Every structure is written in C-alpha cells, then in structure tokens.
Design a protein around this ligand. Sequence first.
Ligand SMILES: O=c1[nH]cnc2c([C@@H]3O[C@H](CO)[C@H]4O[C@@H](CP(=O)(O)O)O[C@H]43)c[nH]c12
Ligand SMILES: O=c1[nH]cnc2c([C@@H]3O[C@H](CO)[C@H]4O[C@@H](CP(=O)(O)O)O[C@H]43)c[nH]c12
Ligand SMILES: O=c1[nH]cnc2c([C@@H]3O[C@H](CO)[C@H]4O[C@@H](CP(=O)(O)O)O[C@H]43)c[nH]c12
Ligand SMILES: [Mg+2]
Ligand SMILES: [Mg+2]
Ligand SMILES: [Mg+2]
Ligand SMILES: [Zn+2]
Ligand SMILES: [Zn+2]
Ligand SMILES: [Zn+2]
Lengths: 274, 274, 274
Amino acid sequence: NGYTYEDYQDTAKWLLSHTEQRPQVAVICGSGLGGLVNKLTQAQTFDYSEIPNFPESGRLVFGILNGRACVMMQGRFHMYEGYPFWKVTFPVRVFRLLGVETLVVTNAAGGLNPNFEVGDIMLIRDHINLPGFSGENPLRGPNEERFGVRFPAMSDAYDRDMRQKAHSTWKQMGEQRELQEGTYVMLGGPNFETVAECRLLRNLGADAVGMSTVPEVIVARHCGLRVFGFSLITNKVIMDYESQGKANHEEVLEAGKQAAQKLEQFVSLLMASI
Amino acid sequence: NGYTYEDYQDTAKWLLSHTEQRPQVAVICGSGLGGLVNKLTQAQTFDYSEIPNFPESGRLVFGILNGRACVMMQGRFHMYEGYPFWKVTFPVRVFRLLGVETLVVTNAAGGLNPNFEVGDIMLIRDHINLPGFSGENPLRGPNEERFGVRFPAMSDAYDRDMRQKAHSTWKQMGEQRELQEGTYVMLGGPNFETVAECRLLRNLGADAVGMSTVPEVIVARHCGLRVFGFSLITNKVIMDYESQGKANHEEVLEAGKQAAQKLEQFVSLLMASI
Amino acid sequence: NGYTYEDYQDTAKWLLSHTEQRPQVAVICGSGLGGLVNKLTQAQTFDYSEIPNFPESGRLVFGILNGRACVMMQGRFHMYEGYPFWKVTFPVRVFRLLGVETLVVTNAAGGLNPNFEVGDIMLIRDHINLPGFSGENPLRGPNEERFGVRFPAMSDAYDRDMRQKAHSTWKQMGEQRELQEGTYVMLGGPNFETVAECRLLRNLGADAVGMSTVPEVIVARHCGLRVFGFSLITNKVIMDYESQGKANHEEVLEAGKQAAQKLEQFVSLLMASI
Ligand SMILES: O=c1[nH]cnc2c([C@@H]3O[C@H](CO)[C@H]4O[C@@H](CP(=O)(O)O)O[C@H]43)c[nH]c12
Ligand SMILES: O=c1[nH]cnc2c([C@@H]3O[C@H](CO)[C@H]4O[C@@H](CP(=O)(O)O)O[C@H]43)c[nH]c12
Ligand SMILES: O=c1[nH]cnc2c([C@@H]3O[C@H](CO)[C@H]4O[C@@H](CP(=O)(O)O)O[C@H]43)c[nH]c12
Ligand SMILES: [Mg+2]
Ligand SMILES: [Mg+2]
Ligand SMILES: [Mg+2]
Ligand SMILES: [Zn+2]
Ligand SMILES: [Zn+2]
Ligand SMILES: [Zn+2]
C-alpha cells in the first residue's frame, strides 16, 4: 500500500471542511449510471483533481437522493489503466472515515449465464476474484488494524437483506424482465475474452464477467461497510466458434445508454431500503 | 508500459535506414524453428544488441522466403526471464510501424490433449491467457490510440483462412500424422507443471501448455496484424501419479531438433498462403 | 530476484561461524507447530533480526530432534504481508548452502475435501500454484545454475518414500482419525474465500487451500532438496449459501493450539524416517 493512514485522514478532513454534507451511503457509479449524480438535491461537486491525494480520472458528488444523504463517484478507477489496487480503492476508505455505512457498487458486464439478455440487471450475490488468486489484492501489505482485521471473511460480502428488498422494489416498478442474480467474476482486461476463456469462466460457476468492483468490495468489507452491488448485462459473450458476433465497446456503451433511465430509477428507489 | 510512442518510431527509423528490405510478414521463431533464418535469400542480420531500444536476448533477420518479404526473430523473450510484457512484445509494435501486415508465431508446448504425440504440430485456434486474468497484460496502462483501441476483441485472433490453407499445405506435403488444431494455454513458468495442475489445465479446455506467444498475439491484434500460430508438441505432460515419466528440457530440445526440417518446410510453404 | 549469489553465501557464512551445529534437516513451522523449537536439545536460537540479509518477521533455531541435526524456522514469511517470493524463500537457499538435504514444510489450511474434519492432518501429495500461473514465481528472473536448472520439474516434488513412512508412523501413534493425503492449492490472501471461489477450487481438484508453502517447495526442489509437507485442517470452508458458518482466524488459531501436542509428536517421530 502506498498511502499512509494519515493520507486518508487528510483527505477526509479536506472534504469535511469544504461541504456541510454528511453522507451515510456511498455509490460508485459503473457503466450506464453516470447520470445518477444529476438526480441529487442540495448537491455539491468536487472534480477528483481538486481533492488532495485522489487518483487521477471524474467527479465526487455529495447530495440527497430519495431521502438519503449520499456521496457518489461519477467515474471509477481500473486495474487495466495501470492503477494498483491500493489506488483503485482509496476512496472507499475515505468514505468510511467520513461516516458512510453502506456502499452501493455497480458495473457493466458480459453475460456468461445463457439465460441472460442484453439490458438485464444482475444482483451480485457473490464474486470470484481471479487477480486475488495470484496475490493482486488491495489488502496486500501490513494490515492497518484501524480499518480492519488481517484475515477478513468474504463469504457474506453481499448483504442478504438488501438483495431481498431489491426484488420487492423491482416488482413495484413492474418490469417485464425478471431481476437476475448471480456470481460476478473479475479479471484484469482490457481485451475482451476469447471463446475458450468464456467457456472456462462459465464452468468456474460465473454468471457475469467484468473488470472492476471486486477490489472495492474487499476493501469495503474489511472496514465494516454494508455492501450491495449489481451488473448491467451489456453483451452476451461469444461461446462458440461458428458465431459471427464479437464483443465491441461501441455496442456496450449503447446498451448502457439504453438502460440509463431504468438504472437511475432502480437505485433511487432502493435508497429507502438501506 | 515503459516505452514511449517515440521509442518505437526511433527503432523503426533506425531499421529502415540500415536495410533496403521492406517486410510484409514477421515470424517469431519458437523452439525448433531457430534455423529458419538460414533459408532466407538476400538476407540481412542485426544482432538484437545493435538495435536501439531492443530488449536483451538473439538476432533480427530480414530476407525473402518463398517469394515473400519477411523479418524474423531468431529467439524471443519470456516472462520467466524477468521481462515485463511491454518488453516481451516491443518488437511486435516495431514490426507494425515497418509496414508488416501478418504475424506468424510459433512455440514448443506440452501436450494436454491425450491424442497428441511428440512431434505433432498443433495449429493454434484459440488461447487461454492465465496471466491476463490477474492483470499481467502488455496493454495494461493508458491506451495508445495510434496503435489500437482501449478494449480490443480477441475471440477472432487466429485467422480462419490461414488455418484452412494450413491443412491444404499439409496434405501436399503428404505427412503421415494429421495436423492437430486446438487451444493453447499460457502460464508463467519456468518450472514444469505438477500432475494436479496438468489435470486442471486439461479440464479448462486447453490442448497444449506453454510459456509464451499469447502476449505477442494480444499486441498484434491490438495494432491490426493478421495472426497465425502453431505449437510443436515436444512432450506429453504427466497426468497421473503412477507414471514414471517426468518433463525435462533436454528431451524437449531433442524433439525440437527432430522436427526442425519439417517445421522449416511447413513454414516456407505456407508463405504463399499469406 | 533481489538477492545476489554472494548475499546467500554471506548469510550462510555468518551462521556457520556463530554455531557449531551442522543441520541435515530444515523444518519450516506452520500454524500449530511453533512450539516444536522447544523440543530441540543442544539448541541455539538466532532472532531473524540478528541474521544479516534475513527478511523481517521470528527465530531460527538449531538443535537435535530425535537424533537428527535440524534447523527450524519458528515463523515464516507470506506474500500477503507484501513480501516478494524471492524474499519469502530466501532461507531455503541458505539452508542448502549450510548442507541441509531435506526440507519439512507445514501449514494450516481450509478443508475443501468434504471428508476432512477440523484437526485432521493432510499429507501434501501434490500442489496447485495459482500465483505461478500468472508468473509470480520465486524462480522468475535469470537462472542461477549454481543452485539448479532453468526448467525444473515439479511432478515429483513431494517425496513418495517419506509419505509412505508417515502412514507407518501414524499407526504406531495409534491415532483414531486416519491420516489424510491430498492436493494443496495456494492463493495469495489475506481474505478468506467466497463460496463461489471455494466451489471453484474444489472442482480444480484441490483438497486443502492455504496461503503459503508452495513457493518454498519450488525453490527447495530447484536446489535439490528432498521435500515432505503436510497441512493441519483448521476449518471446513463454506461451500453453500444457506450455511451460517464463516471462516474466522480466531477459530483457526484455536484449532492450531488443540493440535499442537499431536503435531509435535508426529514430526519428532518422523525424524527417524528421513
Ligand atoms: O464482455 C465483457 N468482458 C469483460 N468486461 C466487460 C465489460 C465492462 O465494460 C468495459 C468494456 O466495454 C470494461 O470496463 C469496465 C467497466 P465498469 O467500470 O466495470 O462498469 O469493465 C468492463 C462489458 N462487457 C464485458
Ligand atoms: O510441458 C511443458 N509445460 C510448459 N512449457 C513447455 C514447453 C516450452 O519449452 C520450454 C521448456 O522446455 C519453455 O520455454 C518456452 C519455449 P517457446 O519460446 O514458447 O518455444 O515455453 C516452454 C515445452 N514443454 C512444456
Ligand atoms: O480457509 C482458509 N483459506 C485460506 N487460508 C487458510 C488458512 C491459513 O491460516 C491463516 C489464516 O487463518 C493464513 O495464513 C497462512 C498460515 P500458514 O503459514 O500457511 O500456516 O495461510 C492461511 C487457514 N484456513 C484457511
Ligand atoms: Mg491530484
Ligand atoms: Mg541495447
Ligand atoms: Mg535485518
Ligand atoms: Zn478550500
Ligand atoms: Zn548506422
Ligand atoms: Zn558475531
């Protein structure tokens, strides 16, 4: 870890003296949810560039959403951009020092489960941390007891009650497609997977594949935060050689734009379940 | 990535001013194919040590092979020697700047498919990038748009037409053994795999296991190169505990020497299919 | 690798001039076996802090155990603490330079095999090196021929004869539970695995999961050492979502304390089988 405990405190101190807002919930906006910061009331924005110690991008926005005090990251950091996990997850620890109690994390992912369709929303019930198997972990290094324990458990990382309420909220929205729920696997990227790799990941028990989130969840659980997350299925991964399809970021972005309104409403409504 | 865009250009410039040769095809010679540089006509060799910015080894040879202008790497770089992938793949980007359009990559690999025999040639139809799952990727870092896109697809990395023609060429050579075709999995090395690991890799869907190639293919596809590759099966990996066999580099080298003449003829002939 | 050949020699020289002991066996004490150093006779201890070049912790103890000259590490190094594998395995090469011929390595591990119970001892018959698949390997870098070969085989890493004798010794101890034997998989840590990851590891063929040992075994085999190892099953990993259990280090430590007397007797007795 490159940051000292003091660096985290210094950043939290700067934020507390520049806004009267005191968030209880933090939201890391993944693909398709970037526009959520526009729904906040009594909002205050800080470009990441103005906040001491923050990694380069991106804006941090404080405000009220459906009755809850929130702090949102419009744009996140990725291992594929060259960032070490201690940088990617820096904001999570700052949020804890600010008084946050719940972390909502979202992303865009390729569908491995054959029953998923583009546009589906998949609640993350569990994850598979591939980089972690090789030691690439935000917790690598001496443990800071002021945040958490040396060996934190992860089998109960995704809050059960929040997932239960998510389905209830979904029914109230009267959506046609059912709300999916499964396992998210994280890999480094930035290239899209080969057919052999996709077949491999599905056989490992994964339902969706992406390049983020897991590191943030690990750090959040370590410092005691409640966690809720979901993936927007932006594409169905290619599983055979006779297929003419091919993953492409252009289409992925469009899927995100198409689901934007739905994702924003979903999140706003679930604020009351926290 | 440690190299700047300018470093690549500088190296390409040095090469262009030191030889009149203008290659259209690049060949990275793996185990057993080191002698191919001796078949080139109007050849010109440069030890890697004389080329500015080149990683340490190894010779770069320009020349004509069966009617095609080529540039060949006699000796490649490996992650197990301590090289980061941005170093291992440096030559691939230089080749693109030189005007190359097709990359032929070869290697020696252990056979996982039970039907393979020592001496067999396996066309690479797909790959599994294990280091990539953990973020070890030549593309890690800010993307250079002058080479390619941020999220390149890899499901169609190994050119279908070239593989089709490879089988046709094989029949004309009248070989006894059939030309194999499957999935190559790359791992770091340098130790040979345990029985448990071999069983694991086979269950992942891999047909052959090696310690190179994949990084070069990823960088090649990113910058638009057409790719063709194959593995020389130098040994059948140990799959059980009651077996007395044991992988050893001495035997692997001998298998390469035994297939040398065959590999050289095969490559020379397939030059006309490009 | 950060250490020079001379660094290893310098450390071995310091140790040889500070004790008359000349060990033939080295024991790296994992969880639950820390108290074994108290059974040595004619013992001499060196805190790791007093030995030039040694990584930070931990004590190195020389002495006689059941008739054999030994050198034991009371405390080991882990990748999750931030140590590169060339640091974690430094002592193994020093032991070889001292004249050691056999390495005994032990650890605490989570049980993946459904038949294992807390307190069980599992002889390590094989391993799966996940960090190694991505290149994280103590042998990464130029090879030092004075220690071993560039491509060492690992399929016969765990000595068959010693495992055979281990079962004989077990019967003489008249234990109620049978001595288990299987595959150990190493991952980075420090967090405990999710349910999805545990299901994944079991399907890979692993019987126990831990965060050490493998790197030490790889380096030992490379320099010619005979190797014997075993895991103390400190907990049964959570394999389903309806389970209320959850891995926790407190319970893991207690399991180690409960098996301490048994582990110490087991090791002392097997000294005669070396
Ligand atoms: O098929 C996929 N494989 C791996 N990743 C992805 C993604 C995610 O969107 C981007 C590429 O279009 C990648 O960048 C991240 C985006 P996010 O911050 O996780 O929402 O994860 C990947 C979508 N589909 C796939
Ligand atoms: O059984 C194998 N497992 C992993 N790698 C290999 C290899 C390859 O040859 C060398 C060891 O003899 C290694 O070095 C590279 C050679 P290449 O540049 O990929 O042709 O990949 C490995 C052969 N058999 C096996
Ligand atoms: O369930 C487990 N998963 C991964 N590791 C472990 C362990 C090992 O004990 C510690 C955590 O309690 C970790 O630290 C090491 C200890 P050792 O030096 O290998 O004996 O490996 C892990 C026990 N149970 C599990
Ligand atoms: Mg700044
Ligand atoms: Mg030079
Ligand atoms: Mg010291
Ligand atoms: Zn100010
Ligand atoms: Zn000149
Ligand atoms: Zn002294």
